[PDB]
Amino acid sequence: SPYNLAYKYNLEYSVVFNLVLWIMTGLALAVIITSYNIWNMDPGYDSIIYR
Amino acid sequence: IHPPVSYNDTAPRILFWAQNFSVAYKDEWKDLTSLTFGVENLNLTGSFWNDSFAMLSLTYEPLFGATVTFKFILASRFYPVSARYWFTMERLEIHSNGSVAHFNVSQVTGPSIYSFHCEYVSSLSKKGSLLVTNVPSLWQMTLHNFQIQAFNVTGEQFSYASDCAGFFSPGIWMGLLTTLFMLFIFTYGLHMILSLKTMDRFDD
Amino acid sequence: TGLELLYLGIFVAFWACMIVVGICYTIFDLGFRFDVAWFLTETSPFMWSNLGIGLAISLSVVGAAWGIYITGSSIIGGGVKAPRIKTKNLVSIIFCEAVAIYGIIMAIVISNMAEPFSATDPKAIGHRNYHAGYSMFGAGLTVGLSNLFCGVCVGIVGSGAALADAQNPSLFVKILIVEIFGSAIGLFGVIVAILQTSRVKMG
Amino acid sequence: NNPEYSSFFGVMGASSAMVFSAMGAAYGTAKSGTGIAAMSVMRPELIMKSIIPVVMAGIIAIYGLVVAVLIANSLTDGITLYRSFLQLGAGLSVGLSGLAAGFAIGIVGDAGVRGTAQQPRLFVGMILILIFAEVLGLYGLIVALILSTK
Amino acid sequence: NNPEYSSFFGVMGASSAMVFSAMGAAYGTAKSGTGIAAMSVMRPELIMKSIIPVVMAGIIAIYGLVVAVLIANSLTDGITLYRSFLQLGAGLSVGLSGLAAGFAIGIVGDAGVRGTAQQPRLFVGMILILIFAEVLGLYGLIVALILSTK
Amino acid sequence: NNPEYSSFFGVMGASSAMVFSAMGAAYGTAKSGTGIAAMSVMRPELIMKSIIPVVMAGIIAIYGLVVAVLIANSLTDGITLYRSFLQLGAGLSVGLSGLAAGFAIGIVGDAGVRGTAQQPRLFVGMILILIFAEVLGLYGLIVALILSTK
Amino acid sequence: NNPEYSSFFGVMGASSAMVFSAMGAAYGTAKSGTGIAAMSVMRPELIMKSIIPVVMAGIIAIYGLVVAVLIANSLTDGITLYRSFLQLGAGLSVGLSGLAAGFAIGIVGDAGVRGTAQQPRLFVGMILILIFAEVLGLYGLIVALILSTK
Amino acid sequence: NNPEYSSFFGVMGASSAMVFSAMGAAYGTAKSGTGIAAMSVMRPELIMKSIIPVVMAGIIAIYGLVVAVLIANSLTDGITLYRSFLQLGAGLSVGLSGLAAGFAIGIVGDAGVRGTAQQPRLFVGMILILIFAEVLGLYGLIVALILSTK
Amino acid sequence: NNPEYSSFFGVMGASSAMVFSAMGAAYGTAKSGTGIAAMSVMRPELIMKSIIPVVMAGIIAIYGLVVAVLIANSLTDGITLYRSFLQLGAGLSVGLSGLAAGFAIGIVGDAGVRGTAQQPRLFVGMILILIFAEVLGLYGLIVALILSTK
Amino acid sequence: NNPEYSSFFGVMGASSAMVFSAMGAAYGTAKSGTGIAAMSVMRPELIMKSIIPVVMAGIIAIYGLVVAVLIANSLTDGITLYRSFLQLGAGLSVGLSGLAAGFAIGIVGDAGVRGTAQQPRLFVGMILILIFAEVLGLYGLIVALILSTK
Amino acid sequence: NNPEYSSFFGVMGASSAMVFSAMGAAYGTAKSGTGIAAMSVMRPELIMKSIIPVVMAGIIAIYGLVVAVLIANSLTDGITLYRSFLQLGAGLSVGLSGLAAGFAIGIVGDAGVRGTAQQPRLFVGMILILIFAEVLGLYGLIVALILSTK
Amino acid sequence: NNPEYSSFFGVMGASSAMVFSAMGAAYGTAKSGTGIAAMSVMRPELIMKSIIPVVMAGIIAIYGLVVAVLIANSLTDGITLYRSFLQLGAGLSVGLSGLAAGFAIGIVGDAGVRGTAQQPRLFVGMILILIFAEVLGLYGLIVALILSTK
């Protein structure tokens, strides 16, 4: 650009950024934790697990 | 693309730019953009510069039935903590047909080597409200994509810019230092509650 | 296991970001951001104060809670086979309550030193007001965490005395010396917290 | 005058007062409840005497409610950060104190009930040991009342 | 003047109200149902009476619903941040209190049900202790109604 | 007029509405299905009855679908942050409540099937307990239908 | 007009649709294969039937492929940030719902295959369980096709 | 013009394509090689047939190589951000799908080879199970070729 | 004059001097006390000789107090940022050295008394090992004086 | 002109080429070296043949050395940021691929050595398994050579 | 000229020299003093000979103290930022090398003393190995003396 | 001219070269010193011969010292930033490669020593494997020499 005008980062950028960051942290944890709990359940097929 | 207003004294010293510059008196808005940027006739009477102080004077003939002038006033204090010349615009003045009005601009600051940029500098509540009035006034003002540099300029071009808006702000940083604390407390609570168990057996 | 791997996962992911962010703001020439001077001015002194007060109670009570249940659950358990336990060993609980008492003494003092400013600019707020805020924080944090540790200690060694007394009646009188040394920790957490508060005034 | 967000901390105070006290009461009721169940099979006559650590865990939720209501009545749109942080300090001081006291009541309850089953002489001592943990809840409430009314 | 973004916190109110209450009622139903199933091989006649824990877990989700719906039916465009943070604090205050109540219902339901099949006299005790668990959901509701109506 | 980035939260709504419901129905189907398979070793006839916890887990996935569709059909370039947050809230509320329901369906479906294998009387109790798990998805749905259409 | 740093979200959608669906199909294969191998030791004839949970997991990868290819042909230089978010939503919604279907398939596959060898009747019931897992992928496909073409 | 940092995304594509495919192929090789090594003791005849899981783990790395080479030969200083993100999307898409295929091939390599030693009839089944793991690498490749090319 | 926030780091110095010394003296006293009490049943005469590890843990609490008093009395709103950092250093130095000493005192106190009650000749060696635990507190004190007095 | 930080990504390239390859070679050497030592007692003659996994682990560190040297030879203060990202990509590409190859060589070596001692026939297989691990370091190198010369 | 914050790094050097060497010497004393106690029951004669690990653990804290005092004497109200970093470097380089040496002295001391109790010939080897551990503190001291005096 | 922070990265070069190398050599000495102590019990003859891994682990400290000294003596206020990144790259290239080599020497030294107790012929094999471990420090030295003088 001809004048080195700044990258125009809006006001409320900290608000958008923290909303996005903490919603995506919360959703990443709720996925990862849920994924871990479902990935590592004991299927518990006791009458056949030993055979 | 609008060119920055450039104050030249043997070389360019102060640069000022906006996506829009407008003002109001008594809620009557006037766009100054086409009356300002790239206008060869732009009256800069009484504009001034010094190694540690700057005053961009913007003057116009028709506004509010009067000659009107804005003085954008900037300093380059030596901030001792960081051992660098942080600059600030500490006030604006508006000079009328016979009087002066003022604003204090809050957040306009950065190291002198960099321009400052903000998406709004304004007195209007939604547009950041950076222009605080300590007393009631008939003036209202808005700079949109405001960008300024009054020290360490090279050529009729800005250096890099400190954007006003960062990854954090007061209510957010205090909001997290509470929330990313009481969520630790909740996890200590939830660790003890999720540690709850029951016996698989009972007596006869 | 699970919650320890979650706390570790968050903790490593956090510091892995902070190493990278600290490098980035250094190497990109962005030391005009990461303005700790901004954080320590625009964060209101009342926030630092009231975290200090709140932690001065609550951490003292958390230490006294572990204090109580560590000694208490041993008092009950020994008491089945040795009924004599249920009176003499209560002194260890009294010292756990004393660790909470030290919390509330200190936190009432700090609370009853707070007052409103009527200003909002760091220059107008000024050093006295900031120093009150930060001092009330550090004092309240120091009594809170010192009582947290003291109460857990007196708990532990109160189970100490109780499980030993259950096997020999004479031991409690001599073992009680360690509970005194445990209890002194919470009192040190008061003395310094008074000193950290003792010179402040807001306005 | 005051910041647009200012009331948020005082609202989190009102919430924390209830939430952390409910967590403390829940654990205190869950451990004591488990104790009661596994005692009652052997000593059915002791249920009505042994509910005590459960009602006391219930009282630690009430200590949170008292503050949560007293904060909530004290809120307004224009609230100064001073009053809003006092209310957050109140929120922790009751809330996490209730979380703490509730854990001591839960564990001492679970011990105390399974002890009393074998040894009727414990029943006075258990309630003395639990009353110390309930007073830890008062040492939250009392300062949270003082802060909210400041 | 009213800012943008503001309806987010009030929405996370109406979310948290339901989500953490459903988690409380799910855990409360999961442990209680494990208890009923693993119990009812021995004492089938106790299936019907032993549903009560599951019903009270269900009530915790209803308290979550009531607050979530009350918040939802009072969200509006351009809401002040004051009412919106109140709606956040309300939604957490029921939601996480109902979560805590749910853990208590779950543990008490499982210990009390498997205990009651060995000893019928436990049943009256279990109901009283389940009331002291379930009321934590009501405390979360009372605070959430109070905050969400300021 | 309205911002870019506005659609992001409403899209995380449609995502969370589906993802967390599919996670819920997957847990419910996983835990129930492993239970059914293990049960069938002893009992050749109970399969077509013991499928029902899997069918109710299947319903949780449909609740996620219903909201995720309503959200996805509501989004446009010009959408205000207000309707977008409401769509995030809806998607989270059905999503995580359908997850909570699915967690409970898995546990009570598995326990209910194992008990039913040893004791056929349990099937009626298993259906009742399971309705009190399945309705958590429905409460999630109700809040999300309200929010996404507010 | 449109910003750059913008097609990135729609690109992460195109990737996620394939990556999480491959992870779903990989877990859905890894457990199911361990099942088929451990089973075959005593019942070799069942292999050509008991492959089904693996084939179903393979279909979860195909749901990922369909959305990832659809997004990868729907992208363009300077794509409107709105469509870039929708494609991110689609890419997570099939990707993680496929991952949820993959977890369900992997569990009920490993249980159901073992169960089928001990109980020859189970095979029909096992397919009727697996259909309620594999359809979670199809629900994730449905919403992802809506969003990516919205 | 492109910003100076533009090539970073594309090169992280080239690295991720290789790295995650090498992590996939390594895990597939590690578990398979443990399975072969253990089974050689008990069935020495099978060692040369039992290499197939390792050869497939090796092929997953070839998919990482192909895409990494295509990214690296596409990449240049003047690259527009659009093409640079597409290359990250391609490189993660094959890379993490190759990781997923690696996980699957590894587990079924171990269990498939162990089962084959105990029961030679499994061999044809194990090939078909492994194909439905190895094809995840090919689906990752197909998406990554589309994204990196168009 | 000095910066507005200057005193904060020095206050954290006074707090850290105490807090980490309360951690160190607590663990050192708690671990030693468990040793002393558990030991004393086997050898009721050896309590007095065995108190010494607790007295050493009290001595490292004195080190934390002495520094925290010196920092707290050196502090003022007028403090230059240099001395505010020296005090932070003194506070971390004594605090975490006292922590290290306390950790050692606890371990060697407990192992020391447990060994001593089996074999009384250990006592003379136990004193020496305890001196080499406690002197770390003294090196923490030395550094913390040399910083905070500068 | 080129930004003065541009060399940072170059030296991190050289570091990552070395470090992660040495980590891979170390793990590959540590596991196989445990395998050799634990094998030696039963089959002392196999030590000199069994070094091959160790040698191949050593080779992975040589791949990292080569690329770290090639990167280092190409550095300059004035380096264009494009070339420094290429060097990071090369560094991670060999470095983490060598980590993967080293992980495989470690697991295969330990299983392969302990198997071979019980059955010599495995050797002919495990050398080919180890080739299919070690080639991952070669692919990581090939990509890193391409990238570091674009 | 120089930033007021500049001395902060140099203070963290002085602190970290003492802090991490105290941790190292504490662990070295704790681990080995547990071993000495356990040993002394069987071999009362070896107590005075077995102290040496603890003496070397003390010496690591002396290397901490040396640098901590050398830095704390070198600090000043306007220190050039270069020298402040050199001091942080000295502090970490002795401090964490001291930690590493303390870990080695700890492990070697415990193992060495117990082994000596079973085999008096180990004492010679134990001292040599302990010097090879303790010298890691001295190598950290060398670099820290260089950096602090450069 | 040259940036004020520049020497910070050069200091972290010197520090990392010593610190991570001391952690590597400490691990090497701790694990092998444990193996020697356990082996000595029934092998008075091997105690001196077995020191090989312990002294070899010391070399990694010296490679760390070499680079640390070589960097530290090359620091200046004027440092061109590029030279500081070369010095970080060097200090990690040795430091973390020495950590890798120290891991390998620790594990190999422990196992190799115990295996040599069981079978004295292993002594040669142990030396050879420890060379393939130790050279990882040496390759890290080579890269760090090249970088620290580029």
Instruction: Quote the CA–CA distance of G132 and A31 in Å, as a whole number.
Output: 21
Inter-chain Cβ pairs, chain C and chain J, closer than 8 A: 5
Under an 8 A CB cutoff, do J3 and H8 touch?
A: no
The answer to whether K77 contacts chain B (CB < 8 Å) is: no
Helices (H) and strands (E) in chain L, counts: 4, 0
Half-sphere exposure of F10 (CA within 13 A, CB side): 29
Do residues B165 and A11 make contact, with C-beta atoms less than 8 angstroms apart?
Answer: yes
- Token couple for F37: 């398979």
Q: Name the minimum distance, in Å, from the CA of C127 to any CA of chain L.
A: 29
Do residues G14 and G93 make contact, with C-beta atoms less than 8 angstroms apart?
Answer: no
The alpha carbon of residue A31 and the mean position of all alpha carbons in its chain are separated, in whole angstroms, by 7
Under an 8 A CB cutoff, do C47 and B177 touch?
A: yes
Do residues K21 and K61 make contact, with C-beta atoms less than 8 angstroms apart?
Answer: yes
Task: From chain K, pick out residues whose CB is under 8 angstroms from the CB of B83.
Answer: 1-4
**Surface of B (74-113) touching C: CB under 8 A:** 81-82, 84, 86, 110-111
Task: From chain J, pick out residues whose CB is under 8 angstroms from the CB of C23.
Answer: 8
Under an 8 A CB cutoff, do F9 and A31 touch?
A: no
Under an 8 A CB cutoff, do E8 and A19 touch?
A: yes
Alpha-carbon distances, residue F110 vs E39, F104, F137, G125 (angstroms):
14, 10, 18, 15
Nearest to J18 among L93, L133, L150 (CB): L93
Under an 8 A CB cutoff, do A10 and B167 touch?
A: no
What one-character DSSP code corresponds to residue D120?
Answer: T
The answer to whether H137 contacts chain J (CB < 8 Å) is: no
Instruction: Quote the CA–CA distance of C120 and C103 in Å, as a whole number.
Output: 31
Q: Where are the alpha helices (DSSP H) in chain H?
A: 7-42, 52-74, 81-118, 122-149
Long-range contacts of the stretch B99-103 (C-beta < 8 A, 24+): B101/B137, B101/B138, B101/B139, B102/B133, B103/B131, B103/B132, B103/B133, B103/B139, B103/B141
Instruction: Quote the CA–CA distance of G147 and F68 in Å, as a whole number.
Output: 9
Cβ-based neighbours of B54, under 8 Å, separated by 6 or more: B13, B14, B48, B72, B73, B74, B75, B76, B150, B151
Cβ-based neighbours of F108, under 8 Å, separated by 6 or more: E29, E30, E33, E34, E37, F53, F126, F129, F130, F133
Do residues E91 and E14 make contact, with C-beta atoms less than 8 angstroms apart?
Answer: yes
- Token couple for I32: 């030693």
Nearest to B4 among A3, A10, A18 (CB): A3
Q: Beta strand pairing status for B48-50 and B20-25? A: unpaired
Do residues I60 and I134 make contact, with C-beta atoms less than 8 angstroms apart?
Answer: yes
The answer to whether K101 contacts chain L (CB < 8 Å) is: yes
Q: Where are the alpha helices (DSSP H) in F41-121?
A: 47-50, 52-74, 81-118
Residue carrying structure tokens 């890691």: K136
Under an 8 A CB cutoff, do K100 and L11 touch?
A: no
Q: Name the minimum distance, in Å, from the CA of B175 to any CA of chain C.
A: 10
What string of H, E and C letters represents the secondary structure of chain B?
CCCCEEEEECEEEEEEECCEEEEEECCEEEECCCCCCCCCCCECCCCEEECCEEEEEEEECCHHHCCEEEEEEEECCCECCCCECEEEEEEEEEECCCCEEEEECCCCEEECCCEEEEEEEECCCCCCCCCECCCCCCEEEEEEEEEEECCCCECCECCCEEECCCCCCHHHHHHHHHHHHHHHHHHHHHHHHHCCCCCCCCCC
Cβ-based neighbours of B178, under 8 Å, separated by 6 or more: C47, C51, D9, D12, D88
Q: Is K56 helix (H, G, I), strand (E, B) or coil?
A: helix
Under an 8 A CB cutoff, do A48 and G99 touch?
A: no
The dihedral built from the CA positions of residue J91, J97, J103 and J108, taken in this order, carries a sign that is: negative
Q: Name the minimum distance, in Å, from the CA of D23 to any CA of chain E.
A: 5
**Surface of G (71-100) touching F: CB under 8 A:** 80-82, 85-86, 88-89, 92-93, 96-97, 100
Give the range of the structural domain holding residue H31, as residue numbers without chain letter: 1-150
Instruction: Quote the CA–CA distance of B121 and B119 in Å, as a whole number.
Output: 7
Instruction: Quote the CA–CA distance of E101 and E55 in Å, as a whole number.
Output: 13
Instruction: Quote the CA–CA distance of C103 and C112 in Å, as a whole number.
Output: 14
Residue carrying structure tokens 């973004």: E5
Under an 8 A CB cutoff, do G61 and H135 touch?
A: yes
Do residues B118 and A9 make contact, with C-beta atoms less than 8 angstroms apart?
Answer: no
Backbone angles phi and psi of D115, in degrees to 5: -70, -55
Instruction: Quote the CA–CA distance of L72 and L14 in Å, as a whole number.
Output: 6
Chain J neighbors (3+ CB pairs < 8 Å):
C, H, L
What one-character DSSP code corresponds to residue J119?
Answer: -
Instruction: Quote the CA–CA distance of I126 and I51 in Å, as a whole number.
Output: 12
Q: Name the minimum distance, in Å, from the CA of C181 to any CA of chain B.
A: 28
DSSP string, H49-71: GGGHHHHHHHHHHHHHHHHHHHH
H/E run at residue E101: helix E81-118
Inter-chain Cβ pairs, chain G and chain H, closer than 8 A: 154
The answer to whether H129 contacts chain G (CB < 8 Å) is: yes
* CB-based burial, D43-77: b 16+ in 10 Å, e otherwise: beebbeebbbbbebbbbbbbbbbbbbbbbbebbee
Q: Name the minimum distance, in Å, from the CA of F126 to any CA of chain G.
A: 18
As a residue count, chain D comes to 150
Nearest CA among C60, C54, C88, C53 for reference residue C74: C88
Nearest CA among B154, B156, B89, B95 for reference residue B118: B89
Q: What letter represents residue B184's amino acid?
A: F
End-to-end CA distance of chain C: 50
Under an 8 A CB cutoff, do B202 and E115 touch?
A: yes
Q: Method of determination?
A: cryo-EM
Instruction: Quote the CA–CA distance of H111 and H38 in Å, as a whole number.
Output: 11
Burial class (CB in 10 A: 0-12, 13-18, 19+), H149: exposed
Instruction: Quote the CA–CA distance of D15 and H149 in Å, as a whole number.
Output: 54
Backbone angles phi and psi of F58, in degrees to 5: -55, -40
K127: left (phi over 0), alpha (psi -120 to 50) or beta: alpha
Do residues J100 and J136 make contact, with C-beta atoms less than 8 angstroms apart?
Answer: yes
Nearest CA among I75, D120, B194 for reference residue E27: B194
Instruction: Quote the CA–CA distance of B126 and B120 in Å, as a whole number.
Output: 9
- Token couple for C36: 């700790």
Q: What letter represents residue L133's amino acid?
A: A
Task: From chain F, pick out residues whose CB is under 8 angstroms from the CB of A24.
Answer: 12
As a residue count, chain B comes to 204
K129: left (phi over 0), alpha (psi -120 to 50) or beta: alpha
- Token couple for G27: 């877990």
Burial class (CB in 10 A: 0-12, 13-18, 19+), K43: middle
Instruction: Quote the CA–CA distance of I112 and I53 in Å, as a whole number.
Output: 9
Task: From chain C, pick out residues whose CB is under 8 angstroms from the CB of L5.
Answer: 26, 31
Do residues F145 and F75 make contact, with C-beta atoms less than 8 angstroms apart?
Answer: no
Nearest to C93 among D90, D115, D129 (CB): D129
Backbone angles phi and psi of B140, in degrees to 5: -135, 155
Cβ-based neighbours of F133, under 8 Å, separated by 6 or more: E26, E29, E30, E33, F56, F101, F104, F105, F108
Q: Which residues pair with B102 in a beta bridge?
A: B93
How many distinct structural domains can be found in chain H?
Answer: 1
Do residues E122 and D41 make contact, with C-beta atoms less than 8 angstroms apart?
Answer: yes
- Token couple for B126: 């939604």
- Token couple for G15: 């990737």
Do residues J20 and L93 make contact, with C-beta atoms less than 8 angstroms apart?
Answer: no
Instruction: Quote the CA–CA distance of G93 and G14 in Å, as a whole number.
Output: 11
Chain I neighbors (3+ CB pairs < 8 Å):
C, K
Q: Name the minimum distance, in Å, from the CA of H10 to any CA of chain J.
A: 9
Angle, in degrees to the nearest 10, between helices A13-39 and C2-27: 150
Alpha-carbon distances, residue C180 vs C96, I107, I114, L117 (angstroms):
11, 20, 21, 52
What one-character DSSP code corresponds to residue I3?
Answer: -
Q: Is D42 helix (H, G, I), strand (E, B) or coil?
A: coil
Q: Is C35 helix (H, G, I), strand (E, B) or coil?
A: coil
Under an 8 A CB cutoff, do B203 and E118 touch?
A: yes
Task: From chain E, pick out residues whose CB is under 8 angstroms from the CB of B186.
Answer: 96
Nearest CA among I33, I24, I34 for reference residue I57: I24
* CB-based burial, G79-114: b 16+ in 10 Å, e otherwise: bbbbbbbbbbbbbbbbbbbbbbbbbbbbbbbbbbbb
The dihedral built from the CA positions of residue L71, L74, L77 and L82, taken in this order, carries a sign that is: negative
Do residues C101 and C187 make contact, with C-beta atoms less than 8 angstroms apart?
Answer: no
What one-character DSSP code corresponds to residue D82?
Answer: H
